[PDB]
Design a protein around this ligand. Structure first.
Ligand SMILES: [Mg+2]
Ligand SMILES: [Mg+2]
Ligand SMILES: [Mg+2]
Ligand SMILES: [Mg+2]
Ligand SMILES: [Mg+2]
Ligand SMILES: [Mg+2]
Ligand SMILES: [Mg+2]
Ligand SMILES: [Mg+2]
Ligand SMILES: [Mg+2]
Ligand SMILES: [Mg+2]
Ligand SMILES: [Mg+2]
Ligand SMILES: [Mg+2]
Ligand SMILES: [Mg+2]
Ligand SMILES: [Mg+2]
Ligand SMILES: [Mg+2]
Ligand SMILES: [Mg+2]
Ligand SMILES: [Mg+2]
Ligand SMILES: [Mg+2]
Ligand SMILES: [Mg+2]
Ligand SMILES: [Mg+2]
Ligand SMILES: [Mg+2]
Ligand SMILES: [Mg+2]
Lengths: 225, 53, 125, 147, 187, 128
RNA sequence: AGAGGGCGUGAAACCGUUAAGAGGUAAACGGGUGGGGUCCGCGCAGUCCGCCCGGAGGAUUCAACCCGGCGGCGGGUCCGGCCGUGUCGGCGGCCCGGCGGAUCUUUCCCGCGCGGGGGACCGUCCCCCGACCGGCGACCGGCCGCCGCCGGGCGCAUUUCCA
RNA sequence: ACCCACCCGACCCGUCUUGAAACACGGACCAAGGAGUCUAACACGUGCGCGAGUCGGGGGCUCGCACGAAAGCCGCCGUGG
RNA sequence: GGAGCGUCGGGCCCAUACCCGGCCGUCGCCGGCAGUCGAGAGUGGACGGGAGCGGCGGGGGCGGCGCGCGCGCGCGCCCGCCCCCGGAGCCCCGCGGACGCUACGCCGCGACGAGUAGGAGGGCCGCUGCGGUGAGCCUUGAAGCCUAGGGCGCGGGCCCGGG
C-alpha cells in the first residue's frame, strides 16, 4: 500500500515540475522570437524608406492598425450619442485608456467622440508600460491584476496566448485574436497627466489635448502611466 | 378615486352605523345562561324528555 | 435529533444570554460558554463537561453515557480528578482522545481544566 | 401589529409619505364611485367594461330554490360510490352493473365532461346532457330519469 | 466619477426561504451543501425551488404525475416534486411509482402505497441519489391560480380576454355599455 | 500589573467628536441628540461647506477594534456572580462591568470571584 | 426638615451668588491645533506576563510497572438473548382483532317493507415460528481491546511542588 | 467632554415655491400634551394548516370559570359559504 | 521697462475629479467552508499472463501529449520483499478531523457609495403593557433627577463612576 502510493505521488510531483519547466522555456523562446520580430519590423520600415529615397520616390508607410484612446473629459453633461460610444469603447471614468483597432467603422466612432478623447498610435514601449504597470485581466468579471502568466493563460490559452509577452504581441501586432485579448485587458486606469495638459477643451491641432495626435500620444502616456 | 383595476364596490356605511353597532361580548355568558335555563327545565319536567314533545 | 432541537433552541433558550454585543450560554456541560452548535451540553448524544470540584481542590469531568438519555438522572457520569496539573490535563486528554469521545472538544476541555486549575490556588500580593 | 406597519418608519419625515407638492387632502376625486361617467371615465371603461346601462329582463320575485340544479360530471361519477362497487364489478361475471343514484349524493344534472371507465353503470338522475348520456351508453350502461 | 446605472445592480432572487419552519431549514442546509460540493445541477434546482413561495411551488396532481411518467423512456425512475402531491379523483388506475415530495395528501398517499409505490422525503432522496441520478424533476402548473385570469391586457381593451374583478356575476354586473354592441360599443 | 489583554492593537478612530444636532447650540429645546435634518432648504442636509457634519456609515470603525475599550477589552455587563463564570474562557478578551443597581455587599462578591478567575473588572474600586 | 403644615421626588426656562476663564467687528456655529483648568489612570522602575528548556538551591510523594476493585467507551463473533424495518410462510389473531363500507344475506335473531343486532364478504389493524435483509443510537449478557477513578504495592538518575 | 485663543470655513430654522438669508409667512423662552387610527369591503404579495376540497360560524355537549367569559369535543363537520 | 493690451515660452499653485494605500458600508461572484490536494490540470486504481533498461524512438516545433528526482529499488540474498500512519512525521495526507462551524455562522476576491418627493431593508435604537424566561437586580438603597468623572457605538442611543 504505502510506499507504492508514496512513489506514485512523488512521480506525479516530478511530472508536474517537468511540465512547468517546459512551459517556462516555451515562453522564454516566444519572447526571444518576438524580440527578433519587433527588431525586423522596425528596421524594415527604415529599409523601405531609404530605398525609396535612393530613387526620386516616396515610401508611404502603412496606415496604423491600432490606437490608444484616453478619455480626457468628465462625466457630466454629455450628449446621448457620445455617451453611448464612450461606453462602447469602455471609457466610463475620465483618464481611462483603451487600445482600439483601427478601421473605417472604429475610426468613425472615434470621430463622434472627438472632443471627449485624446488618442493616437502608441509605441511598442507604450504598450509594454501600460500592460506591465497597469495590466489587469477581466477574470470571472473581476478586475484582477496580471501578476502571473497562469492568469493570462487560464483565460486566453485557447488562442495561443500563454504569457504577458504574448498578450503584448497580440495587442501591438493586432493579431487574429486581438479582440479577445483586448477585451480581457480591463480598461487602463491611468493617473492625471503630470506636467498638466495644454487645454482639455480644444483639439490638439488648435492647441488643445483632444482628438488624434498620432505619434504624440506616446508623450502623454508616459506622463500619465 | 379608483386606481387601476379593482371591484367597483359599494359599502353601506353612509348611515349612522356606529350608533347601531351590536357587539357580541355577551355570547359566552349567553350560551351559559341558555344552558343553565335548559338544565333547569330538565329538572322541573322530571322524567319527561328534556327535548320536549 | 440534535440538529432539530438546535433549530428549536438556537435563539430562545433560558440558558442563552445576549446583551452588550456578545452572546453566551449558561447551559451545563458547555465548556467555552458559547451559543454554538458544537459547544452545547444539552443537544448532543455525546457531551463533555469540565466543572470545578465542590471540594475547592480539583476538577470534575462530566461525560454523557448514550446508554439512555430520556433518563437524565442516569445520563451524565461524573469523575473528580485531584492531581498535579499536568496529569490532570493528560487524564482529560486521554478521556477525550483515546475513547474517541467528542474529539471536537478535546483541546477546549483541556483549556477549561487549565483555567479551573489556575482559579484554585494562592491568589496574588 | 403597529410595530410592523409603515407609519413607524415615517416618524420624522414631514409629509408622512404623501408628498409635499400635492398633499393628503380630504377627497380629491369625489367620494367613492363618483365620476364614472365624467372624469374617472377612463378607469371605469378600461377595467369595468359594461358597468353602465341596462340589459336583459327584470324578474321580480326571484326565488333561487326553484332553479336549483347542481351538476356532476362523468369525470367523477364513480367517486360518488364506495370503491368496492367499482371493484365488485369488473369482477362478478354476471354483467351486473351497479346503480349510482346521483340525486342521493346531491346533484340533479349529469353533465358530460370526462372519460368514463369501461365498466357498465345504471345512473339515476333528474336530468342528463346529450353527451353525458351517449358516454354512459357506450360504456355499456343505462340512463334512468327520476322525479 | 463613473457612469453606470446603479438601478438594476442588486439582483432580487431569493437566497434562503422566508419560512421559519425548522424542518424545511434543515433540508435547505442539506441541499446547499450538496449543491455546491457536487457537480449536479439537480441539487441546484432543488435548492432554488426550496426557497420559493407557496404560490410559486404549486401542487402537482396525481394524474399529471402519472402522465408525465407514462412518457416513453422514464421507466423505473423517481419523480421529484418540491411542492405537494395531491389526489386525482378523476383518475382510477394508478401505477406503482417512486415519488419525492415535501408533502403528499393523505388520500394521495394511500393511493400510491396501495398500488405498490414508494414515497420519499428529501433527506431520503439525498441518501438514495445525491446527484439526482435517475430522477424526473416535475412541477405543478404555475399559472393555475385564478389570479392569472385577472392579469394581462386589461378588460375593455380590444382582443383582451381578461377576467374583470366583479363583486358577483349575473345579468346586471357589467355586460352593458362596453360589451354589447347594442349599448355604445364593444371591445 | 493589571490583566493584560491577549492582543492590544492600535485602536484608530475616524472621528472622535460627537455628531451634534443642527441648531442644538441655539436652543435649549433642541438636544445634542442627532437627527437627520429633513428641511427643504438646509445648509446641513445638503452638505454645504463649513457646516455640521452628517454621520454616514463611512465613519464606521474597523471591525477588529469596534467596541474595544482603551485597555483592549470589550465590556460585558455582569449583573451577578453566576453571570461571571461565563467569561472564564474569554478573560483575555472581554471584561466584566458590574452594574449600577448591584448592591455594595454583592459587588464585593463579584469582584473577588473575578480576581480568582482573572477576569478584568472595569469598575471594581468604586462602591465600598 | 438637604421631609417644616400648598411640606415626597423637585427637571427646564428664568434669576441670585460663589469659583474659573474671556471680552472694540452681536452672539453662536463647523474644521484644525495650541494654552489653561477639571477630574481620571498612574509610577515613588511599568519594565508586563505565560510555555518549554539549562543550571544551582530546597520539597514532598509518585507517575512508568504490575496486582485488586469500580466505572465508562468502542468493537466485532451478532456468539447468546431482548429489540424493530422491508419481504416471504402460517390464514395463524380472523369468532379467543376491532372499526369502516351505498359489498352481501331479510336461509338468521329481536323490534316494528323499515330500525337494531347478529351472520357472511371486502378494506384496514394483531399472534406464532422459521428464513433472508437494513444489524438500524433500540437494548441487554458475556468476551475482547482501550480509557479513567479508587485502593494496593514501587523510596528515588523517577515525581511533582516552591523560590 | 469645561473654558479660552488663533487661522480657515461659515447668512435662520420650518415651509409653499421654477427660485428663500430674504423687504415671503410661522417661531420671545422652557416644560408636559399633540396628528395616518380602528371597523368593514376588495385586491395583490408573503407565512402556516389542510387539499377537490376547505371552513367555522351559529348552535350544542363538557363547570361553581381562580386562571375561562378561555380550552376541548360535536352522524351538528356541514344547513350553509 | 505693467500688476494694461495682442502673441508665445518654461516653472509653479489646488477640487469632494484622476492614481496608489488604509478603513466603513452596499452590490456581485452558479464565490469558499459540515472537513480534503491541488494551481494553464491534461486521471486514479484493480488484477492476470508475458517480460525489462525497457520505455510511446510522432514538429527549427520553437510548444502545450509526455520526460529526466528513479519505473527497479535499498535492503534481506540469481531469488524474496517493494511491509502497518494508533505512527508518513507532516506543504498533503482520500484512517480522523478548525483556534473557525450562533451555517440567520464564519471566510475570500472584485466592483461601486450625490439625492428632494417617494419606495424598500436592517436597527443588541427608544417608550408603555401582556405570555414566557433570567435560582435577574433592590433599604448593604429601586425609579426618577443632577453631574468641568470614565467609556462604547456612524447613529438612533447605551454602559459604567460620584451625588
Ligand atoms: Mg460642464
Ligand atoms: Mg330545542
Ligand atoms: Mg425623504
Ligand atoms: Mg405614499
Ligand atoms: Mg405638507
Ligand atoms: Mg394628490
Ligand atoms: Mg399641483
Ligand atoms: Mg443612485
Ligand atoms: Mg433596484
Ligand atoms: Mg430648494
Ligand atoms: Mg423627603
Ligand atoms: Mg409622595
Ligand atoms: Mg418638596
Ligand atoms: Mg449659575
Ligand atoms: Mg469674575
Ligand atoms: Mg428657508
Ligand atoms: Mg428682498
Ligand atoms: Mg400664507
Ligand atoms: Mg411672528
Ligand atoms: Mg411630548
Ligand atoms: Mg394569499
Ligand atoms: Mg446614497
Amino acid at each position: 500500500n504505502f510506499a507504492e502510493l508514496k512513489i506514485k505521488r512523488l512521480r506525479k510531483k516530478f511530472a508536474q515540475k517537468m511540465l512547468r519547466k517546459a512551459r517556462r522555456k516555451l515562453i522564454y523562446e516566444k519572447a526571444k522570437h518576438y524580440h527578433k520580430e519587433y527588431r525586423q519590423m522596425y528596421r524594415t520600415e527604415i529599409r523601405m524608406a531609404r530605398m525609396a529615397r535612393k530613387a526620386g520616390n516616396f515610401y508611404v508607410p502603412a496606415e496604423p492598425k491600432l490606437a490608444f484612446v484616453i478619455r480626457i473629459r468628465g462625466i457630466n453633461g454629455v450628449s446621448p450619442k457620445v455617451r453611448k460610444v464612450l461606453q462602447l469603447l469602455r471609457l466610463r471614468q475620465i483618464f481611462n485608456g483603451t487600445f482600439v483597432k483601427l478601421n473605417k467603422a472604429s475610426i468613425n466612432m472615434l470621430r463622434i467622440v472627438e472632443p471627449y478623447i485624446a488618442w493616437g498610435y502608441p509605441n511598442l514601449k507604450s504598450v509594454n508600460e501600460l500592460i506591465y504597470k497597469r495590466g489587469y485581466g477581466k477574470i470571472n468579471k473581476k478586475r484582477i491584476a496580471l501578476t502571473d502568466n497562469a492568469l493570462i493563460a487560464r483565460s486566453l490559452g485557447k488562442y495561443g496566448i500563454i504569457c504577458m509577452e504574448d498578450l503584448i504581441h497580440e495587442i501591438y501586432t493586432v493579431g487574429k485574436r486581438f479582440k479577445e485579448a483586448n477585451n480581457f485587458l480591463w480598461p487602463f486606469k491611468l493617473s492625471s497627466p503630470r506636467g498638466g495638459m495644454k487645454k482639455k477643451t480644444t483639439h490638439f491641432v488648435e492647441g488643445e489635448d483632444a482628438g488624434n495626435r498620432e505619434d504624440q500620444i506616446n508623450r502623454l502616456i508616459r506622463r500619465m502611466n | 378615486a379608483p386606481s387601476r383595476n379593482g371591484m367597483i364596490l359599494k359599502p353601506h356605511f353612509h348611515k349612522d352605523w356606529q350608533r347601531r353597532v351590536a357587539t357580541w361580548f355577551n355570547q359566552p355568558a349567553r350560551k351559559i345562561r341558555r344552558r343553565k335555563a335548559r338544565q333547569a327545565r330538565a329538572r322541573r319536567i322530571a322524567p319527561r324528555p328534556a327535548s320536549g314533545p | 435529533s440534535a440538529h432539530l432541537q438546535w433549530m428549536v433552541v438556537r435563539n430562545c433558550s433560558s440558558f442563552l444570554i445576549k446583551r452588550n454585543k456578545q452572546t453566551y450560554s449558561t447551559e451545563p456541560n458547555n465548556l467555552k460558554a458559547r451559543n454554538s452548535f458544537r459547544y452545547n451540553g444539552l443537544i448532543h448524544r455525546k457531551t463533555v463537561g469540565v466543572e470545578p470540584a465542590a471540594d475547592g481542590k480539583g476538577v470534575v469531568v462530566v461525560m454523557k453515557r448514550r446508554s439512555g438519555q430520556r433518563k437524565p438522572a442516569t445520563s451524565y457520569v461524573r469523575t473528580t480528578i485531584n492531581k498535579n496539573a499536568r496529569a490532570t490535563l493528560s487524564s482529560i486528554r486521554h478521556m477525550i482522545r483515546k475513547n474517541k469521545y467528542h474529539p471536537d472538544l478535546r483541546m477546549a476541555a483541556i483549556r477549561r481544566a487549565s483555567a479551573i486549575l489556575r482559579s484554585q490556588k494562592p491568589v496574588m500580593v | 401589529p403597529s410595530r410592523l406597519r409603515k407609519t413607524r418608519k415615517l416618524r420624522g419625515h414631514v409629509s408622512h409619505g404623501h408628498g409635499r407638492i400635492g398633499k393628503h387632502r380630504k377627497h380629491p376625486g369625489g367620494r367613492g364611485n363618483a365620476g364614472g361617467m365624467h372624469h374617472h371615465r377612463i378607469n371605469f371603461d378600461k377595467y369595468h367594461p359594461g358597468y353602465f346601462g341596462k340589459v336583459g329582463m327584470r324578474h321580480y320575485h326571484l326565488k333561487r330554490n326553484q332553479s336549483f340544479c347542481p351538476t356532476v360530471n362523468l369525470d367523477k361519477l364513480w367517486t360518488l360510490v364506495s370503491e368496492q362497487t367499482r371493484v365488485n364489478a369488473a369482477k362478478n361475471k354476471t354483467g351486473a352493473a351497479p346503480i349510482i343514484d346521483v340525486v342521493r349524493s346531491g346533484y340533479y344534472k349529469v353533465l358530460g365532461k370526462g372519460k368514463l371507465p369501461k365498466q357498465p353503470v345504471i345512473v339515476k338522475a333528474k336530468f342528463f346532457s346529450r353527451r353525458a348520456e351517449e358516454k354512459i351508453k357506450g360504456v355499456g350502461g343505462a340512463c334512468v330519469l327520476v322525479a | 466619477g463613473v457612469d453606470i446605472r446603479h438601478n438594476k445592480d442588486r439582483k432580487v432572487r431569493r437566497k434562503e426561504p422566508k419560512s421559519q419552519d425548522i424542518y424545511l431549514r434543515l433540508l435547505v442546509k442539506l441541499y446547499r451543501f450538496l449543491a455546491r460540493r457536487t457537480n449536479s445541477t439537480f441539487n441546484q434546482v432543488v435548492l432554488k425551488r426550496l426557497f420559493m413561495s407557496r404560490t410559486n411551488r404549486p401542487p402537482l396532481s396525481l394524474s399529471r404525475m402519472i402522465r408525465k411518467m407514462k412518457l416513453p423512456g422514464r421507466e423505473g425512475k423517481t419523480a421529484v416534486v418540491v411542492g405537494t402531491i395531491t389526489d386525482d379523483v378523476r383518475v382510477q388506475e394508478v401505477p406503482k411509482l417512486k415519488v419525492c415530495a415535501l408533502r403528499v395528501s393523505s388520500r394521495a398517499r394511500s393511493r400510491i402505497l396501495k398500488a405498490g409505490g414508494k414515497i420519499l422525503t428529501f433527506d431520503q432522496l439525498a441518501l438514495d441519489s445525491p446527484k439526482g441520478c435517475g430522477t424526473v424533476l416535475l412541477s405543478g402548473p404555475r399559472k393555475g391560480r385564478e389570479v392569472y385570469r385577472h392579469f394581462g391586457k386589461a378588460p375593455g381593451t380590444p382582443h383582451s380576454h381578461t377576467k374583470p374583478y366583479v363583486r358577483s356575476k349575473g345579468r346586471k354586473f357589467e355586460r352593458a355599455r362596453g360589451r354589447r354592441a347594442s349599448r355604445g360599443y364593444k371591445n | 500589573a493589571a490583566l493584560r489583554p491577549l492582543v492590544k492593537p492600535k485602536i484608530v478612530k475616524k472621528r472622535t467628536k460627537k455628531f451634534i444636532r443642527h441648531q442644538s447650540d441655539r436652543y435649549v429645546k433642541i438636544k445634542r441628540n442627532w437627527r437627520k435634518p429633513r428641511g427643504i432648504d438646509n445648509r446641513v442636509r445638503r452638505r454645504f461647506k463649513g457646516q455640521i457634519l452628517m454621520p454616514n456609515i463611512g465613519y464606521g470603525s474597523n471591525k477588529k477594534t469596534k467596541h474595544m475599550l482603551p485597555s483592549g477589552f470589550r465590556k460585558f455587563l455582569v449583573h451577578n456572580v453566576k453571570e461571571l463564570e461565563v467569561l472564564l474562557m474569554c478573560n483575555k478578551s472581554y471584561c466584566a462591568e458590574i452594574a449600577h443597581n448591584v448592591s455594595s455587599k454583592n459587588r464585593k462578591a463579584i469582584v473577588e470571584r473575578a480576581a480568582q478567575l482573572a477576569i478584568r473588572v472595569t469598575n471594581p474600586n468604586a462602591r465600598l
